[PDB]
């Protein structure tokens, strides 16, 4: 099972011999009963792997974590209640007051809020790099830096970073590369770990879940970053831990040190855990992830062709276009479809964008991306942003109906 299409259905689960349930049960339980007191000792002492408490782990969530880990080619994963929480728990494990991270400036608005407003209240500052130039990432790094953070394809301008060059800059300064791969659709479009990323985060809310039913995040550990080698920047990864009678994580867990700490420390103490109900919804999504991503990208390519030749369209941003500023990176790293998104500029005054979105009858006007239903938004008049710009999350409806919906909306706004 190299194949994503098979992993998305089978990885991380085998029917338990008690029930032999073919589908993944929903373990709607807070707790798990000890076999005896000494069993509980070993569980709480981390002396034995087992279910302790659903704030930390849950057999349903475990399948979701293992399956996403398998699809990204990581060693293991930890689920969170949202993508924001996946980002926050990651940075809070890597950095502490006085530390900083180096981040692309091309960010999801919620992530910018985190990096620019929330984390500085905890003494964690971010140096933003706008240029994408390796030299600029390198120059931003100082002795207090704890990560380079980039999105695998930014939103709504679809900048694809030089994963390999940036990973090397990070590794050569002793810090991990963290990649928000939400727009890589769970490893279908982009696999950052294959290109040097140490940690991958996702908003499972989007393409991973695929049906807009469920908020969720996930942190995937590549297992590839040597915390011992870089204990000068990450002493909590190796030094005796205040929370587990001096447990030394690296000594105990090796390549899983980071993701184990996420679970036994950060899930335990911040508590941004994922419901097993949410997990099951996401698993149903993941079972078709490859098929959906495949059709999403195919529809997106055709929609970009439609918008190129529309007399009402000023411009098109699509990472597959040769004119796109970071096309050589998209070409290099997106070999299974150029994602599910495009952005367009419409002709006319400032109200044109909103008229075109408001006139859509199939495409929905809302915040989300990565739903099976097509979504659009006029981001400046509502929520790389320009007032002619419409951002479009292309769904898996029949392409002719998506196109027709924009056609009738254009006819109404432009006669």
């Amino acid at each position: 099972f190299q194949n994503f299409e098979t992993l998305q259905l089978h990885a991380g689960y085998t029917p338990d011999p008690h029930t032999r349930s073919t589908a993944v049960p929903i373990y709607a339980t807070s707790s798990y009963t000890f076999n005896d007191s000494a069993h509980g000792a070993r569980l709480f002492g981390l002396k034995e792997l087992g279910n302790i408490y659903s704030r930390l782990m849950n057999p349903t969530v475990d399948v979701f974590e293992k399956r996403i880990a398998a699809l990204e080619g990581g060693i293991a994963a930890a689920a969170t209640s949202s993508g924001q929480a996946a980002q926050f728990l990651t940075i809070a494990t890597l950095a502490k007051a006085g530390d900083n991270i180096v981040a692309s400036s091309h960010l999801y608005g919620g992530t910018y809020n985190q990096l620019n407003v929330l984390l500085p209240r905890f003494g964690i500052k971010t140096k933003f790099v706008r240029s994408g130039k390796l030299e600029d990432y390198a120059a931003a790094i100082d002795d207090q830096t704890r990560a380079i953070y980039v999105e695998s394809m930014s939103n709504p301008d679809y900048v694809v970073p030089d994963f390999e060059g940036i990973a090397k800059i990070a590794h050569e300064h002793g810090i991990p590369l963290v990649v928000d791969n939400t727009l890589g659709a769970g490893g279908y479009y982009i696999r950052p770990i294959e290109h040097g990323a140490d940690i991958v985060v996702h908003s499972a809310t989007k393409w991973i879940g695929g049906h807009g039913t469920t908020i969720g995040g996930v942190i995937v550990d590549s297992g590839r970053f040597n915390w011992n080698k870089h204990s000068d920047r990450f002493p909590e990864m190796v030094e005796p831990s205040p929370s587990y009678h001096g447990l030394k994580y690296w000594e105990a867990f090796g390549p899983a040190t980071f993701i184990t700490r996420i679970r036994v420390e950060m899930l335990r103490d911040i508590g941004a855990c994922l419901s097993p109900f949410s997990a099951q919804q996401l698993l149903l999504g993941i079972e078709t992830l490859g098929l959906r991503a495949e059709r999403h990208a195919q529809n997106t390519e055709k929609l970009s062709k439609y918008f190129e030749s529309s007399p009402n369209v000023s411009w098109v941003l699509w990472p597959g276009s040769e004119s796109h500023p970071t096309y050589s990176q998209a070409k290099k790293y997106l070999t299974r479809g150029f994602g599910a998104m495009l952005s367009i500029g419409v002709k006319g005054d400032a109200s044109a964008g909103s008229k075109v979105v408001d006139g859509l009858k199939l495409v929905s006007n809302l915040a989300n991306v990565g739903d099976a239903k097509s979504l659009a938004i006029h981001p400046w008049s509502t929520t790389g942003v320009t007032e002619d710009m419409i951002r479009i999350s292309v769904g898996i409806e029949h392409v002719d109906d998506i196109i027709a919906d924009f056609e009738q909306s254009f006819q109404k706004a432009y006669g």
Copy 2:
């Protein structure tokens, strides 16, 4: 309504005219479709109230929030993914790097981890007060303190704080009193807002949910802390916000300032949100909260009497007992039953505690509390000297008394006693 038993079925929900659904629907949606672009702008610009995105709000969760606020007598509440998250979001809203909080030392271990290990990494330190004395709370406060934090009833020793005296100290120092009222059962046993608490947090995982199916937390805002009067310690409550283009929270939201910031800043940026499936589980729990807490407390009282007359028991720790160190506070603040917990010391060597628990066949052996099923643990040999500071002893069994028939609970301990002592 005034009555807890009616509120827990009705507060915060009216059937929508579309479906007229009598029970609360599960809004298994991440998103909510705009009426138009201008509508989307007003929602995102906080110029209009309405559903935007389930990381921040959700009509199922909204019922859960409003119902818990009504039960506690707060103005509003915000749900979180867990009890820990409720505590964490609360402290992170009150304090930032270089600030501190003063807390009782009688703390849930996960809370102690937050205050002693996790938050200090973010420059947020805690001064612990062990004595319960008002003067020690007062002396621990300094100009960087941002809250006093206590549990309404600690565990496993069931210390009840002097809510009113502590709230007075806090309010004189210009800081809120934050109370973890998990062991007050949703406001059935203990009602800290009635006694000066400004912010109440819960592990809804426990008695609120009541069935051990669901992790969840909730933050309840009393609405009673005047952030403007105390803006010298809380400038972010009154000053123009960087998050929302200079939005001044107190000016816009007044008494809802804290809980509004929890939602529009902390749920939004930390993302520890509660699933609608979880909120629905919790709502089924809440619909019987009064009935369960009542039986819990009645069983717990009867079990205290059974244990205090058992030859096998060295001692009983129960907040309803006049010999309890903080009984005067328990008598004042717990008038609807003295809780659902107790602790006992068993006679014999150090293995007697783990043998009595291991020998239980009805009561379950696990670390959770606040299930309808009875639970017991020997914390010394399991979750936990450093143990002694925590209030844990070799001989202590901690019991979360369920709502089973108390005769069956007693029979279960009796046959385990017979097996451990002959």
